[PDB]
């Protein structure tokens, strides 16, 4: 303040030579002197541009320009060699750039960020890799200060980079980037791709280990979506909070739907917190008349299930209208069926009878996709549960209701499959959905399946030597989940079909089936675990990543006692050519296996060394059996294989801690040597 007043007292020439001396003094190596000089350069930049003195020299006239000042000083200040100096330099840079924004000197911004070929995207890419967090905080602040006045057209990749800094694992980085994106979406309301990248950024925030930034995301989405839309009579296009929330759920339809699981977790928090309201029910019922109700209906998929206390007749009428209609959106009808199932405890039988009759007639219609069939059959399980209040009563009612469509589709399969079949005399989709309907029925009546059905689907299996065959194996698995005798009869044929058949999709389905039989019958399919271990070496990477997901689900519950061969497979799968699947493997072990138990690699290291060395004569260990097929799959040895050996070894070293490193150095220098 005193300098500013004295500079107002100072003439332009005295100011000019004094800026010359201060620019020379900026090259002094004193760190607090440099900090003070850059701070008072920022103080000078708080003032507007000094009046142009044509009597002064060219070196003095160039001091007057603020563009030349920010080109000379803070270009070197942001590119210094000290972290705190660069931190304060970037803070002063953000302050001076918002100062140029308030002085409306956008040409300075274009000259720095997009100079005609020093690139500010490049130095920002440097700043986000800096160790210091507040350097990245100043960097995100200055890159969100820019482009609030300009369109994103041509530079949506900068926004893509912005949710890449939302990825940065610091509390303050997300804790300020979330506020930055929320003020971005209200800076301009009308850009679809900004909202798309926004929702892609914000839906993995709430899975963080830290709880407060998760909650700040939760109520920020509450004020963005829950606290925007009003009653439909109150709703107006001018009320753009409602319009923005409607557009945001319009972007929730067919774009990203895994986030509904995060929404289920969030509503689980608000079910613990009981933050759902009957006023919200009144608002969504008021918006049932709108055509925007379909994402509101899938929001109601679990929200309405908490406490059904109201009248839902208009919803039943709309469901009847779209069920009489033959080609709706499948998601809309499925969500309407699940909300009907969730409110069925309050609904009377006087509507439930005609609902079940309409279901029965349209099931005889067979006018749906298979996802709608699955939603319908679980919803009809809900309708039988709400119909009955006795286990015997729901048993008998579900038995007869499933028996009707069971005998119907059983008669259809006897007319088609048991009779002669041409190459193109059938529609594949009709028969596949018929078998899927019978599989859902046999899921819902395990007591009503007979040995004639067993030999029928065994004859279907006998028509092997494709698309229908894998689904037949899936339905066979659903049945043998309930039938251990059919499981024992089937598993040599299933194991044979695993290592004989050639289509990738049917073997994927066989592995999925027999691993859910592993979840049911671990005590018996523990001997068939090494079939999974040899199937881990597939040609197709999608098969390998799917088996990685299955083995991750097996390891997270810890179904089986831990054997060294399983650990050998966990190590051996990490040399995938595709890096994403392998990195999923290291992320899974780092966030889950290291969390569950830290000492597994400590005992497993020495037998891992022996396993990759083809050494079997150890006195203490190497007692596991081996097959010829896995012997020729495990090309793990030699000069052609040493690189992945010490790559894996140093990965395990960085997994080991310093105390673990000391103890493992003691163990290797005693026992092995």
């Amino acid at each position: 303040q005193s300098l500013v007043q004295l500079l107002s007292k100072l003439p332009c020439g005295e100011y000019a030579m004094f800026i010359a001396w201060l620019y020379k003094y900026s090259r002094s190596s004193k760190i607090p002197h440099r900090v003070f000089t850059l701070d008072v350069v920022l103080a000078l930049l708080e003032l507007p541009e000094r009046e142009v003195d044509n009597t002064l020299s060219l070196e003095h006239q160039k001091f007057l320009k603020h563009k030349f000042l920010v080109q000379e000083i803070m270009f070197d200040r942001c590119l210094d060699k000290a972290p705190t100096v660069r931190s304060k330099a970037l803070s002063s840079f953000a302050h001076c750039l918002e100062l140029t924004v308030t002085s409306a000197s956008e040409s300075i911004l274009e000259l720095l960020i997009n100079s005609p070929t020093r690139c500010v995207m490049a130095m920002l890419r440097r700043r986000i890799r800096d160790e210091k967090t507040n350097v990245r905080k100043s960097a995100l602040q200055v890159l969100v200060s820019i482009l609030k006045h300009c369109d994103v057209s041509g530079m949506k990749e900068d926004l893509w980079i912005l949710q890449d800094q939302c990825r940065d694992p610091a509390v303050s980085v997300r804790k300020q980037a979330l506020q930055s994106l929320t003020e971005l979406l209200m800076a301009q309301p009308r850009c679809v791709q900004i909202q798309k990248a926004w929702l892609r950024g914000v839906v993995p925030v709430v899975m963080d280990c830290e709880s407060t930034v998760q909650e700040k995301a939760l109520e920020f989405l509450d004020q963005l979506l829950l606290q925007n839309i009003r009653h439909h009579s109150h709703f107006h296009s001018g009320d753009d909070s409602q319009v923005l929330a409607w557009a945001l759920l319009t972007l929730l339809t067919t774009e990203s739907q895994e986030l509904s699981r995060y929404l289920n977790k969030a509503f689980h928090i608000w079910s613990k917190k009981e933050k759902f309201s009957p006023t919200f029910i009144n608002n969504v019922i008021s918006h049932t008349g709108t055509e925007h109700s379909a994402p509101a209906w899938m929001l109601l998929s679990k929200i309405a299930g908490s406490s059904p206390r109201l009248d839902y007749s208009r919803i039943i009428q709309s469901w009847e209208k779209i069920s009489s209609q033959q080609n709706p959106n499948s998601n809309t009808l499925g969500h309407i069926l699940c909300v009907i199932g969730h409110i069925a405890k309050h609904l009377p039988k006087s509507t439930r009878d005609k609902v079940t009759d309409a279901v029965k007639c349209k099931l005889n219609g067979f006018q749906w996709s298979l996802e709608v069939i699955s939603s319908a059959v679980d919803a009809l399980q809900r309708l039988c549960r709400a119909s009955a209040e006795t286990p015997a009563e729901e048993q008998e009612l579900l038995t007869q209701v499933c028996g009707d469509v069971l005998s119907t589709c059983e008669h259809r399969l006897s007319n088609i499959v048991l009779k002669e079949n041409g190459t193109g005399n059938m529609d594949e989709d009709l028969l596949v959905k018929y078998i899927f309907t019978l599989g859902d029925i046999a899921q819902l009546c395990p007591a009503r399946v007979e040995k004639r059905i067993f030999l029928l689907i065994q004859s279907v299996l006998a028509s092997s030597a494709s698309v229908i065959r894998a689904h037949a194996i899936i339905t066979l698995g659903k049945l043998c989940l309930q039938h251990e005798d059919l499981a024992k009869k089937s598993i040599p044929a299933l194991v044979r079909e695993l290592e004989v058949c050639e289509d990738v999709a049917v073997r994927n389905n066989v592995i999925i089936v027999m691993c859910d039989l592993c979840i049911r019958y671990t005590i018996m399919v523990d001997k068939y675990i090494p079939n999974i271990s040899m199937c881990l070496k597939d040609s197709d990477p999608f098969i390998r990543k799917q088996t990685l997901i299955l083995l991750t689900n097996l390891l997270q519950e810890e179904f089986v006692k831990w054997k060294g061969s399983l650990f050998f497979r966990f190590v051996s799968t990490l040399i995938d050519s595709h890096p994403d699947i392998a990195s999923f493997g290291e992320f899974c072990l780092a966030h889950l296996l290291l969390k569950r138990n830290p000492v597994m690699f400590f005992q497993h290291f020495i037998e891992c060394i022996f396993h990759f060395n083809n050494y079997e004569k150890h006195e203490k260990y190497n007692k596991f059996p081996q097959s010829e097929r896995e012997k020729r799959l495990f090309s793990l040895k030699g000069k052609s294989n040493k690189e992945r050996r010490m790559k894996i070894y140093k990965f395990l070293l960085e997994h080991f801690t310093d105390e673990q490193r000391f103890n493992i150095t003691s163990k290797i220098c005693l026992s092995i040597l």
């Binding site: 993995p204 895994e258 899921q443 894998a470 799917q546």
Partner: protein, 59 residues
């Protein structure tokens, strides 16, 4: 650093599993419908089933 988490690595809610239980031939309830992953299988036009439709489809 931290990538996207696979959605199948999260256990479902308990009340949902109460809402869809699976019973036996004797009629006693043995498990729930959400305890098994073929309910979460997603169809393909070739007839394949995947847990994650988001990602690279096989050729």
């Amino acid at each position: 650093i931290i990538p996207l988490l696979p959605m199948a690595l999260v256990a479902p809610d308990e009340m949902e599993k109460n809402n869809n239980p699976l019973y036996s031939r004797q009629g006693e309830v043995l498990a729930s419908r959400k305890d098994f992953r073929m309910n979460t299988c997603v169809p393909h036009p070739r007839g394949a089933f995947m847990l994650e439709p988001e990602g690279m489809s096989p050729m």
